[PDB]
Curated annotation (Swiss-Prot), chains E, F:
The chain holds residues 333 to 569 of 2185 of the full protein. It comes from the Viruses. Forms an icosahedral capsid of pseudo T=3 symmetry with capsid proteins VP2 and VP3. The capsid is 300 Angstroms in diameter, composed of 60 copies of each capsid protein and enclosing the viral positive strand RNA genome. This is Capsid protein VP3. The lineage of its organism: Viruses, Riboviria, Orthornavirae, Pisuviricota, Pisoniviricetes. It comes from Coxsackievirus B3 (strain Nancy). It is found in: Virion; Host cytoplasm. Interacts with capsid protein VP0 and capsid protein VP1 to form heterotrimeric protomers. Five protomers subsequently associate to form pentamers which serve as building blocks for the capsid. Interacts with capsid protein VP4 in the mature capsid. Interacts with protein 2C; this interaction may be important for virion morphogenesis.
From Swiss-Prot, chain I:
The chain holds residues 21 to 138 of 365 of the full protein. The Ig-like C2-type 1 domain mediates homodimerization and interaction with JAML. The PDZ-binding motif mediates interaction with MPDZ and MAGI1. N-glycosylated. It comes from the Eukaryota. This is Coxsackievirus and adenovirus receptor. Monomer. May form homodimer. Interacts with LNX, MAGI1, DLG4, PRKCABP, TJP1 and CTNNB1. Interacts with MPDZ; recruits MPDZ to intercellular contact sites. Interacts with JAML (homodimeric form). Secreted isoform 3, isoform 4 and isoform 5 can interact with the extracellular domain of the receptor. (Microbial infection) Interacts with adenovirus subgroups A, C, D, E and F fiber proteins as well as coxsackievirus B1, B2, B3, B4, B5 and B6 capsid proteins. Component of the epithelial apical junction complex that may function as a homophilic cell adhesion molecule and is essential for tight junction integrity. Also involved in transepithelial migration of leukocytes through adhesive interactions with JAML a transmembrane protein of the plasma membrane of leukocytes. The interaction between both receptors also mediates the activation of gamma-delta T-cells, a subpopulation of T-cells residing in epithelia and involved in tissue homeostasis and repair. Expressed in pancreas, brain, heart, small intestine, testis, prostate and at a lower level in liver and lung. Isoform 5 is ubiquitously expressed. Isoform 3 is expressed in heart, lung and pancreas. In skeletal muscle, isoform 1 is found at the neuromuscular junction and isoform 2 is found in blood vessels. In cardiac muscle, isoform 1 and isoform 2 are found at intercalated disks. In heart expressed in subendothelial layers of the vessel wall but not in the luminal endothelial surface. Expression is elevated in hearts with dilated cardiomyopathy. Coiled coil: none annotated. Residues 1-114 form the Ig-like C2-type domain. Disulfide bonds join 21-100. Glycans are attached at residue 86.
Amino acid sequence: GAQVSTQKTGAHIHYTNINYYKDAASNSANRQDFTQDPGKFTEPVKDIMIKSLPAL
Amino acid sequence: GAQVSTQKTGAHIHYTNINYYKDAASNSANRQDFTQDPGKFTEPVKDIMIKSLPAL
Amino acid sequence: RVADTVGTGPTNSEAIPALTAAETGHTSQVVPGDTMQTRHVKNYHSRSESTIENFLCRSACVYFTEYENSGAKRYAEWVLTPRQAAQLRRKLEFFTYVRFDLELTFVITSTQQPSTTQNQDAQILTHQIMYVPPGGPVPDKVDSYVWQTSTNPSVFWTEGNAPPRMSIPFLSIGNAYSNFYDGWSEFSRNGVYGINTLNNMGTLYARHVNAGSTGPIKSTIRIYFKPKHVKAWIPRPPRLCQYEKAKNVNFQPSGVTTTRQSITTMTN
Amino acid sequence: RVADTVGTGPTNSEAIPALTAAETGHTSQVVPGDTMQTRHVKNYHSRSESTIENFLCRSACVYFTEYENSGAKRYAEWVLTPRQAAQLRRKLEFFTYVRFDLELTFVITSTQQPSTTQNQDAQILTHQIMYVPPGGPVPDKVDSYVWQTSTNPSVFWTEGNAPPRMSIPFLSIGNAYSNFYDGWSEFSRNGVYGINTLNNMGTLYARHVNAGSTGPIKSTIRIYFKPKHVKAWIPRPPRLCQYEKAKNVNFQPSGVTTTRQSITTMTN
Amino acid sequence: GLPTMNTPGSCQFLTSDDFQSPSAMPQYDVTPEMRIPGEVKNLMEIAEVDSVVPVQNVGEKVNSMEAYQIPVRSNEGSGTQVFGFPLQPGYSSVFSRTLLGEILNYYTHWSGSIKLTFMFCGSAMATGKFLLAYSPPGAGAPTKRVDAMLGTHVVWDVGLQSSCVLCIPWISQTHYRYVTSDEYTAGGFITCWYQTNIVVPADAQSSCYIMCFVSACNDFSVRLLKDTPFISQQNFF
Amino acid sequence: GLPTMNTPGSCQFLTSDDFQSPSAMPQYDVTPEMRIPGEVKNLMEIAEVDSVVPVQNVGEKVNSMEAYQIPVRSNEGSGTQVFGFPLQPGYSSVFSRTLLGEILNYYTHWSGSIKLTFMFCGSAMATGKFLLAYSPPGAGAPTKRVDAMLGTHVVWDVGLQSSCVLCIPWISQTHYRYVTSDEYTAGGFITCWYQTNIVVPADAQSSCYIMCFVSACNDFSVRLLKDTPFISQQNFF
Amino acid sequence: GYSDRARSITLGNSTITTQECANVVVGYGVWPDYLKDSEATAEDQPTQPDVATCRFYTLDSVQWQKTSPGWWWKLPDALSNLGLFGQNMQYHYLGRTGYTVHVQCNASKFHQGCLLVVCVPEAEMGCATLDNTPSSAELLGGDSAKEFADKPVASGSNKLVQRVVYNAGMGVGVGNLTIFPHQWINLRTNNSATIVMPYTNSVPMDNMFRHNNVTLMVIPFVPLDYCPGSTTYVPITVTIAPMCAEYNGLRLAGH
Amino acid sequence: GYSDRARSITLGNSTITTQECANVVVGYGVWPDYLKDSEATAEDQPTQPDVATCRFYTLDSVQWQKTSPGWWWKLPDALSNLGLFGQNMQYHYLGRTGYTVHVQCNASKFHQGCLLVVCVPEAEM
Amino acid sequence: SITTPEEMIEKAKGETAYLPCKFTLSPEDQGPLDIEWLISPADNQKVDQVIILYSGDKIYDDYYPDLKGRVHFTSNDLKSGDASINVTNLQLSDIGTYQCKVKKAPGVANKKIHLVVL
């Protein structure tokens, strides 16, 4: 039960990880978890505002 | 001969374990053994008692 | 996991769940919904940590003794029994018969004693711990021939290393260990009451393999008992009064519980 | 990765992206191409290091205390709280509620104190660190019976070895830890403002298992807190003024920012 | 010859660890398992069994069998309080020693319902009606039967059925509470009043007693294993 | 009994490491996750939100709400400078304290565009035209409106639309810059001039103010996590 | 042919009408809703009056002077003495609710000014003593609006909240307050600001007395100014309506 | 095997238990229900707390002496100062509700007596 | 945690000064309760001199001679958060700094009260 994942590499390779504890809180950090959702902070308005159209 | 089992996780992942001794009493504790049978302590009566029906 | 609360509505009927009889010795097992209006709830709580394996499988110090590299006392002997320490003992006494595997870990520390000796040079101290089975020969002196450990399991530990650890299989002539024995060893009932041939494991002997230094050194050994693959039978009430003697359940009468200023009082 | 710049040409039209209203509380989100002619660019930059897991998952010293092998002070006790150190604290206070796993690493160093004692022989010092849960008994003295650690997790470390490390699961009666609590513990609002039953972890006790040497020795223990599997909710403005008391956000009024000679000035 | 690198935490002794150790005695045959009744597999099963609770724990009564009994009688009045105590099974003196309280002292958090069973121990001719009631936190302990009725209550009538069960529902902001006394996680107040006066015939005692039994429901759990303060030791035995 | 060989770096403690450690408490059930609004998964999302910037940070104005406001008025002249500051979000005093500047102090490099939003806070009758402009490095800060026009500029006219946005394009030799002040990686100069004079009617104030909001674009990134100098501590609390 | 800057919100038996508004900020994109059976904890059936509890409650007005530092309110505390909502919590142990904050302020074309309307959850405020904590009376002003101080509050032995407007009593930059859901009223473009806030707390439900979930702050970054012969007195009315309120833990009234 | 003279009524968070009752009289054969859209008049949406308003409210007890003539109560008025019910009407112009009256009195076999429990609508005195 | 630990009390002569030292204990606190009232004189003589001590569920009222039979704990519970003392006869000498210490392992809480008599 070994998990093979891609290493952080530059642009323009793989690593194997096994869990030796059943605790699960004893695992390593989830470094490769990049997710972006700024829509809530930037625009929490009720009516969608198109850039081409004037605000008011 | 590696045994893959599920780690303890919260609600609302896996770990591999191998035995290096043939003694077997040399193994780790069975932490994941949750079984409930309180019926004997709570109701060891001969005749089953229904809650809807009055006791006596 | 645990049971999920079930949504209920006002009910007028002949059914009377709350009314019951405690004389039958049967627990009522009445849910909250029987006596009041509740909302459906999806409980995700789990009874994982309340299991006997989780409750009893922890290392607990049962006995610590000391020895010297010179002088009269040169070796320390202790017979295996968990009643030495009140903590681990009280947890074990929760049931009548317990069957489990045993794991032993020893922590050894050496402290230099005050002396007028000069130019003291110390060499890495090596400690030998020997386990003797019941009926096995016991060493009379530190430099006795018994320390050969031909058929006796023994462990040699050098200071600055991880503590020595060994796993012992369940040993009992009987099917399970007995926490409480009601009776006498003698068929004539003329002996210490509660003595049993059961729960007899062995004796532990600890000594310094080498003197190490001209100056006096004293080392204390602590024995840790961790139960494994534990099994429990016949649960009994927990100890209410402080333990006096390991051999007998002798106790001093103790107030059922603490008092309060009066009934109807919400504080201690 | 990040968004790629899009090539644009001169445009004359009724569309007015730059003109907008900031009263709506909506960010304009205007790209460079809307207001000027750009060339197509294939950006390969990635927002990897700016993630909360990457930002908060580093070991930071939160508290260091010392104890002796003789004299009055023989043991050191510290309650678990990350507000002791301003650095780790300020990073954590960025959000309102944070849920995360905790990893503890301890660095222990012993320094010999000045003394008139002669012929000093030192034995490898062993240190015991015991974690006590809220409501658990606390040891009155160094040689107290509590150090048995029957149900209390404890770690024994010998000098010259890698620092002891243990992993703690998220512990909070509430769904998530609360960085800022607005209110009083008492229903009558007559208590310390901002006190919460949440964020209570435990107390750490550190002592010397053995004296080791006749001469006096003092050891300092440093506690490191590394968050793991962190989660963040409701972002808030970063601290502007220096922390005075860990218990309350009490601060001293501070200039919004540094000054300059005048407006139109390109330097500080 | 495999390259290896040690990490922080090597050669350390954590009391609560799960590793493999060598067997002191190799190839040892243990005694075969025998069928013994009342096998336990979880501590909760023990905590679900009714335990007699000493409500009248006052003065020298804790040194007698009188602590467990609860006194009631015929009084020329109505709305009086039979008894009152807070919902603190781990900390309150009344529940600190029950099968539930004894087990709740080895854990830090507790979350679930509690069942209280009251058994009238008067004569067959003796009759009466009581108002068992539980009041939520954030309100002062009710002082009159008018105030107490507002909260969760159960009118109990003495009848052929010897006991009536009052089930305290779990009403808390957080998912868990604290076994040790804590103001933030306040439990609540449990009180009993006289719905109607006790009525007895001639040549019959007007003074009776009641028994309380406290057990846990099917949704009770505990967490954070800790040591029990009760047991104390200054030297080895 | 497997042969093993340790390598340089054994039994060492690196603060930024990713290894597995034993659990202090085994088999512990944590509280179930609850839905909480405004969850954050990346620091950049926070840095993309408009932050009020105090351009007029001079004298005792930083101790008042006047630092954020920017003064404009009716003057018998043209081509005058409303304000001027360099493109140094990490180091410049004007941006060192903004949501963008506060976050840029925990990183060493930064690469992306910057959005500046200016909101006229005058009366409805007040009207005017300004010349927002950004000038590249290697040329002296423009001193007259003739020089400033040469670089990236946006003529802003006061209108029903309250604010106009000036987007500073990323024009750099290297792929990244330095958050700390650095001569090699010079950013540029941002200035504002009067395209036309402010014009007001009778019984109307001729003195108005403007507000600046600075946020990042969708192509802004940071690197090299470092500690922030701002927070200081001499003793534990 | 509707107008973008024209709106009307109808809750219970109360209706508000604005003919000059910017938009509506719905918190962090979450709309007030009831508690689900998966995230609930209290086993007892929740009580939801709905029409009586959820309705617009207009608080006392304030005067916007040229030197006005700012004002602040505790949303749960403010409505504690108004209507059934106030009565409901007095008799209930737990309470979970959402709010809609409609700040109203109007002025003539000639008048020029600017205000910031922002909802800050868990706004723990500092105290001038630097050893004590602010008193309940100083922090909470039911049926009133607590004001900010321009000059720093004097430090001594007492329980007075640092009302410093620039640190805002939270020891943070006033300009960085836009991170929370907010809206701006400028007397040249806006005549009102409307914000919808979902219930936000670590626990599923909490006591509404000793604990305050959110805090409304109105601060003018640019001051109110106008020429002579104009209207000197300019008021500001705050209307707050609870949304999807529900209570648990019936008991005798009190706190 | 239930007993005819044994019952329990559960309303809101209150439960009553009787181990010696005769039966239950449901008015004139009509069970309390809400107002239908055909027989309603007030156009505004009705507010129904349900759990808080509908629950058992215990009034003060009285003493049954040998010369006790009798007692009387006004159902709407009696509960006007108790719980949310009392508060609800204080803030509402109209109100429509049904009631369940459980009179309780117990005595020993040796005691002998008799009482009449009756609900009289529009009892103009 | 002690409510308003730093404060100043002003009272006229012979008016009986009540000093409030109400505390609140955290879950971790499980050690023996020890209360210590130490007074620092305005005379500028030796400071940190104890007046009244409460330990081992017992009270000691003789640690400072000037206050002889004048300092009594206002509350009889004492274990309860309220741990306050009241001086019956206010005097000109009374002026000074009074420190209240509540020690329950782990964690020590301290309260300082400045007393001025008019």
